[PDB]
Each structure stands twice: as structure tokens, then as C-alpha cells.
């Protein structure tokens, strides 16, 4: 239950993203890297910072960037 659009819309497209790269979801861990996103206002810091904290999984450059795009489309409303 979020109140903005920004955030639903970046979750829904980061598990998109998720399903289309890894071909796994976790709607949730989405939402962690939303807010992440929703923070980072730099491309590269969002990559450092999946790095960083989920690591622990293998982001590709394009993911990471793909996750940018749709939490930037969310962020100006780009919809």
C-alpha cells in the first residue's frame, strides 16, 4: 500500500525487469532497490549500491540501467 504512483510503477517495472533478465521475481527485493532508486538520483550509485547490499545476486549493466530508466520514468512521471 503506497500512495504514489512512482514507487508502484518502478516495483511493477523492476519485477518486470526481474522476470525479463533473471527470470525470477521477488516483487519485494523491487521494491528494496525502488527505494534505493527513489534515493539515488546518479545512475552509477545505484549500481554501486546493489553492488554493496545485493550483491549477493548478479545485476547486468543493463538491468541496473533498465531499473534506472523505469524508477527515473516513475520519478518525472513518465508514464
Do not use: C, H, Q
Not at 527485493?29 to 549500481?47: W, Y
Amino acid at each position: 500500500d503506497l500512495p504514489s504512483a512512482f514507487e508502484e510503477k518502478a516495483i511493477e517495472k523492476v519485477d518486470d525487469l526481474l522476470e525479463s533478465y533473471m527470470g525470477i521475481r521477488d516483487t519485494e527485493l523491487a521494491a528494496t532497490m525502488v527505494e534505493l532508486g527513489k534515493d539515488k538520483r546518479n545512475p552509477d550509485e545505484l549500481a554501486e549500491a546493489l553492488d554493496e547490499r545485493l550483491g549477493d545476486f548478479a545485476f547486468p549493466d543493463e538491468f541496473v540501467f533498465d531499473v534506472w530508466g523505469a524508477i527515473g520514468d516513475a520519478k518525472v512521471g513518465r508514464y
